[PDB]
Amino acid sequence: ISPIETVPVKLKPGMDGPKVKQWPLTEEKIKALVEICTEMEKEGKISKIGPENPYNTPVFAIKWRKLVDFRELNKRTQDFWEVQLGIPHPAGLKKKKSVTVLDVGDAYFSVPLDEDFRKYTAFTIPSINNETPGIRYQYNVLPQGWKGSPAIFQSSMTKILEPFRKQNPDIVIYQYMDDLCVGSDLEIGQHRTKIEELRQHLLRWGLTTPDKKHQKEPPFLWMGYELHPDKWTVQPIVLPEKDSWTVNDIQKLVGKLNWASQIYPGIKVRQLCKLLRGTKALTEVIPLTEEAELELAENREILKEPVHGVYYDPSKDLIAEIQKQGQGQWTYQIYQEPFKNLKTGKYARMRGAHTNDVKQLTEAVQKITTESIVIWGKTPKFKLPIQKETWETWWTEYWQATWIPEWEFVNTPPLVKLWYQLEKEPIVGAETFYVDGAANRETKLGKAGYVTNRGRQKVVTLTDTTNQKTELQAIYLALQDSGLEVNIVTDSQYALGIIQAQPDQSESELVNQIIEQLIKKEKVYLAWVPAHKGIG
Amino acid sequence: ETVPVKLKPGMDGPKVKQWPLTEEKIKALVEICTEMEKEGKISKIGPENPYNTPVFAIKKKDSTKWRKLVDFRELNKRTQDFIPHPAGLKKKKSVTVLDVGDAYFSVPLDEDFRKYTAFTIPSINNETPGIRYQYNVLPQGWKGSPAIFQSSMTKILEPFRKQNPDIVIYQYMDDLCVGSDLEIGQHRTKIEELRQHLLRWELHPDKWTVQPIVLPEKDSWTVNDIQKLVGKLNWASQIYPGIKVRQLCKLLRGTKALTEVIPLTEEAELELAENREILKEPVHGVYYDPSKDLIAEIQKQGQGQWTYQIYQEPFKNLKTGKYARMRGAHTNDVKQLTEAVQKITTESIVIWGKTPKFKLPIQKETWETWWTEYWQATWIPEWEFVNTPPLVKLWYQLEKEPIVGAETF
Numbered sequence: 047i048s049p050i051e052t053v054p055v056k057l058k059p060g061m062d063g064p065k066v067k068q069w070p071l072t073e074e075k076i077k078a079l080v081e082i083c084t085e086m087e088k089e090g091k092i093s094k095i096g097p098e099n100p101y102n103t104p105v106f107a108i109k110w111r112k113l114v115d116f117r118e119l120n121k122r123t124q125d126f127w128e129v130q131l132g133i134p135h136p137a138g139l140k141k142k143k144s145v146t147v148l149d150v151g152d153a154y155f156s157v158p159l160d161e162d163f164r165k166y167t168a169f170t171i172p173s174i175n176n177e178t179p180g181i182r183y184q185y186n187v188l189p190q191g192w193k194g195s196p197a198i199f200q201s202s203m204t205k206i207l208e209p210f211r212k213q214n215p216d217i218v219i220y221q222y223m224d225d226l227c228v229g230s231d232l233e234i235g236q237h238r239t240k241i242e243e244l245r246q247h248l249l250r251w252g253l254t255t256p257d258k259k260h261q262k263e264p265p266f267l268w269m270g271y272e273l274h275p276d277k278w279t280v281q282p283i284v285l286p287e288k289d290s291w292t293v294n295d296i297q298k299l300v301g302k303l304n305w306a307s308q309i310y311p312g313i314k315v316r317q318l319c320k321l322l323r324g325t326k327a328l329t330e331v332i333p334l335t336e337e338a339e340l341e342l343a344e345n346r347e348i349l350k351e352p353v354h355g356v357y358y359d360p361s362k363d364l365i366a367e368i369q370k371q372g373q374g375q376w377t378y379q380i381y382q383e384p385f386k387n388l389k390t391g392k393y394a395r396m397r398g399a400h401t402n403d404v405k406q407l408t409e410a411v412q413k414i415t416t417e418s419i420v421i422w423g424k425t426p427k428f429k430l431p432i433q434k435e436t437w438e439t440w441w442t443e444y445w446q447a448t449w450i451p452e453w454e455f456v457n458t459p460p461l462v463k464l465w466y467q468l469e470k471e472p473i474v475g476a477e478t479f480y481v482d483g484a485a486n487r488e489t490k491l492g493k494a495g496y497v498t499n500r501g502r503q504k505v506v507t508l509t510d511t512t513n514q515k516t517e518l519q520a521i522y523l524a525l526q527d528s529g530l531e532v533n534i535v536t537d538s539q540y541a542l543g544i545i546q547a548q549p550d551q552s553e554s555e556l557v558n559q560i561i562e563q564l565i566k567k568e569k570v571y572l573a574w575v576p577a578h579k580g581i582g
Numbered sequence: 583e584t585v586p587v588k589l590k591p592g593m594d595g596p597k598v599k600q601w602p603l604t605e606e607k608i609k610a611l612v613e614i615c616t617e618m619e620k621e622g623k624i625s626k627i628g629p630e631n632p633y634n635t636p637v638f639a640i641k642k643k644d645s646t647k648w649r650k651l652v653d654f655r656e657l658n659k660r661t662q663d664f665i666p667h668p669a670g671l672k673k674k675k676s677v678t679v680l681d682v683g684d685a686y687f688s689v690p691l692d693e694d695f696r697k698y699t700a701f702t703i704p705s706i707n708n709e710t711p712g713i714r715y716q717y718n719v720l721p722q723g724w725k726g727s728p729a730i731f732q733s734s735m736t737k738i739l740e741p742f743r744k745q746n747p748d749i750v751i752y753q754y755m756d757d758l759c760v761g762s763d764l765e766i767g768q769h770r771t772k773i774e775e776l777r778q779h780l781l782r783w784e785l786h787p788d789k790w791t792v793q794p795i796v797l798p799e800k801d802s803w804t805v806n807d808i809q810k811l812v813g814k815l816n817w818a819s820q821i822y823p824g825i826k827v828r829q830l831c832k833l834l835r836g837t838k839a840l841t842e843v844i845p846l847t848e849e850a851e852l853e854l855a856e857n858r859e860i861l862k863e864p865v866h867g868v869y870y871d872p873s874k875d876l877i878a879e880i881q882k883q884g885q886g887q888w889t890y891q892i893y894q895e896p897f898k899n900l901k902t903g904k905y906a907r908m909r910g911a912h913t914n915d916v917k918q919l920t921e922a923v924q925k926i927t928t929e930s931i932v933i934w935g936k937t938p939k940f941k942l943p944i945q946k947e948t949w950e951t952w953w954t955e956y957w958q959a960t961w962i963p964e965w966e967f968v969n970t971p972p973l974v975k976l977w978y979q980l981e982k983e984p985i986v987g988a989e990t991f
């Protein structure tokens with residue numbers, strides 16, 4: 047019946063075909079369906095069956111249109127490779143003299159189904175006299191909404207396009223969903239001609255496409271962007287305008303803005319997000335504060351501006367430049383020619399238990415690198431706000447293996463630097479503070495203090511504290527009460543980690559206070575010693 | 583003719599994702615695969631096959647051409663079970679490794695098992711669906727390939743073995759390790775002789791052991807000096823219970839300046855002496871257990887230096903050592919680490935005959951996006967990413983080094 051070879055399909059091991067009862071349907075709904083299945087049978091899409099067929103699926107009606115529910119069949123159907131969920135990004139596309147888009151929607155139903163598996167798709171047309179035997183059928187082609195259809199259809203398209211592609215090297219085809227997107231750098235007449243050749247080639251296999259009178263118009267709306275065959279733009283983003291905002295409204299908005307932060311610089315949600323505190327219900331009406339009214343306002347302005355883009359030229363350099371927009375926050379733009387970006391983005395404030403700015407820069411760099419490999423199969427040359435000396439100093443001695451691909455320095459404030467650097471050896475002439483902190487773990491009552499070789503001492507009692515905290519507070523006190531250079535001895539295990547990693551940011555607000563003190567000193571030497579020893 | 587290989591009971595085939603590759607690597611893999619399919623070694627597949635094994639391309643030891651490397655680790659683990667280790671290979675003045683992974687394409691793979699060898703050449707920007715294949719012939723890097731061909735491999739080895747019995751020949755996956763005491767030239771001339779036999783169808787184990795730890799020795803010691811010493815020794819007592827810091831700590835009482843000089847008690851004096859002696863030899867009673875996994879932990883020491891320990895039980899090392907980066911690896915922590923893992927896995931194989939599981943002081947993402955760029959072996963070991971404990975590093979930093987070094991006028 048059909049030219050294309052079928053793909054052998056199976057039900058997950060052990061499981062069996064669907065057995066769902068057919069809902070009762072009104073008389074006009076049954077008629078509509080009775081007619082659609084007379085035509086579908088005629089066209090060859092389905093076959094009249096009804097004897098030894100146990101399986102069944104519910105048919106529906108939404109001129110009427112039928113809808114079969116294969117959720118159950120899908121639950122019983124084997125697994126397939128996967129119909130890739132990773133779709134291309136405009137930044138990776140190439141500028142083409144011509145691009146045509148062929149909707150191959152009905153091509154779905156033009157691909158045969160493993161006859162061996164067709165029994166499973168059986169469904170039934172109800173009756174008025176609920177009693178009478180229903181009209182039974184089954185599918186001969188890939189059912190709309192069935193599990194295997196996307197995968198099998200595309201595999202089929204792949205084998206059918208093989209020859210054409212071989213005979214036409216200068217032509218790029220992209221298949222996705224039920225859309226063939228054909229592009230090239232041939233003269234428009236020659237391109238139009240080759241499209242027609244492709245259409246008749248597909249048609250030779252039973253696949254239909256709309257004529258030149260029906261094919262879709264470039265610019266094409268494709269997942270947020272507007273594609274022109276010579277550049278791309280961003281479909282303008284529209285922010286509502288209401289007198290009453292509910293939590294849903296505010297979360298939806300914050301959602302939209304956050305997506306825009308990527309392409310647009312300066313979008314902010316801090317004040318809008320504040321509206322979400324202690325909210326008791328989704329439908330709750332929160333009034334915008336002045337600042338949220340304002341913030342909302344400036345964002346509307348920013349989004350008015352048109353953000354255009356450019357395509358990828360493989361004969362040109364790929365460059366990535368990075369900015370630290372605030373602590374933990376990073377912005378980047380990848381381009382080829384100065385000021386003509388291919389892509390831009392930012393990474394949400396990276397927050398953790400303890401790290402440093404240089405380490406974070408390093409991570410931003412690798413996220414970019416993974417994204418670039420995917421988009422361009424190449425790695426950008428990097429222009430980073432950090433001096434070579436700074437990198438060489440930090441990396442060369444950090445405890446963890448780290449790297450940054452070829453890069454060059456770009457002096458664009460604020461630069462990424464080392465906020466402090468613990469001394470390598472004890473400091474001659476600096477007061478030496480022996481610190482200690484202890485707390486009852488259960489009563490959460492403790493004491494933190496020190497004694498210095500110069501005779502300075504202090505102790506403070508704390509309540510609702512932990513042991514870890516008294517120890518760290520001991521260190522905090524020493525830093526507060528000492529001169530510009532200080533030596534500090536501690537048996538705290540967490541200080542041992544500070545010595546190794548020398549973090550400039552942390553979760554612990556106490557550690558953060560210590561860090562601020564550490565940064566303030568001219569010289570600090572931190573020394574760890576085993577606890578409960580004959581030391582101190 | 584094919585032996586019916588099967589999966590370990592209750593196990594399914596590998597469904598591992600293909601990581602993204604550079605453009606260069608993709609072009610290369612496509613060629614390589616077009617050729618293999620011509621030659622009937624692999625065949626394109628349908629979507630009804632849901633299994634996958636990552637694949638990638640390398641350029642091992644000098645080569646203006648790419649080699650295809652497949653990561654069958656997962657598949658190997660799910661594959662059923664089926665020669666022991668030449669205890670003396672470890673004792674040969676010199677070993678040389680050979681890539682005999684080509685022998686395998688000379689044999690067909692059980693029909694019903696090929697589905698599990700499915701792999702996918704990715705496409706740039708997803709502008710195209712991956713190119714899927716599966717093997718028809720025994721694939722390089724799979725654990726069954728060296729077994730199912732043992733028969734034919736041994737067969738081709740006898741005449742050479744039974745010709746030199748002053749040479750040990752050991753096999754592991756795609757490789758063959760051979761060691762002899764003959765001088766350098768002879769060794770190689772004999773190696774080539776072996777390869778010639780093969781065509782018809784640089785290690786020196788005299789260096790490896792557990793390394794000696796050496797405590798500082800000093801004119802005068804400061805409070806800080808003793809403090810550091812004391813913390814290292816206290817940690818080390820988890821290995822040698824006879825190590826003690828009682829006398830040293832008594833010198834650490836009172837609040838003296840970190841830089842003040844302290845005179846060592848005649849007792850503390852002996853204590854340091856007794857300690858130095860205990861550390862003169864590897865701890866007693868450590869033996870390899872063939873039934874337990876072998877562990878390999880690495881620490882980054884800085885300035886291109888790396889220390890490692892191989893053990894099965896905590897603090898009971900089978901071997902320990904140092905690794906200094908090679909030439910032109912100066913700016914690449916990832917290159918250095920990679921190189922070290924290959925060198926450590928190789929010794930691991932030359933000694934116990936299996937690969938160890940590595941504990942790596944690197945962030946997972948850093949390792950995953952760049953390790954293949956510098957890999958050169960046919961095998962791939964297991965690994966986990968860890969945080970190095972400050973003291974573990976400070977301790978092994980202490981191992982003794984050559985007086986001058988290893989001469990080579």
Ligand SMILES: CC[C@H]1C(=O)Nc2ccc(F)cc2N1C(=O)OC(C)C
Nearest residue numbers: 139140145218220227228229273275
């Ligand atoms: C086939 C040509 C291919 C390409 O290289 N550049 C462009 C440029 C403009 C377009 F509108 C489409 C595409 N192309 C493409 O595959 O786009 C799909 C993801 C929509």
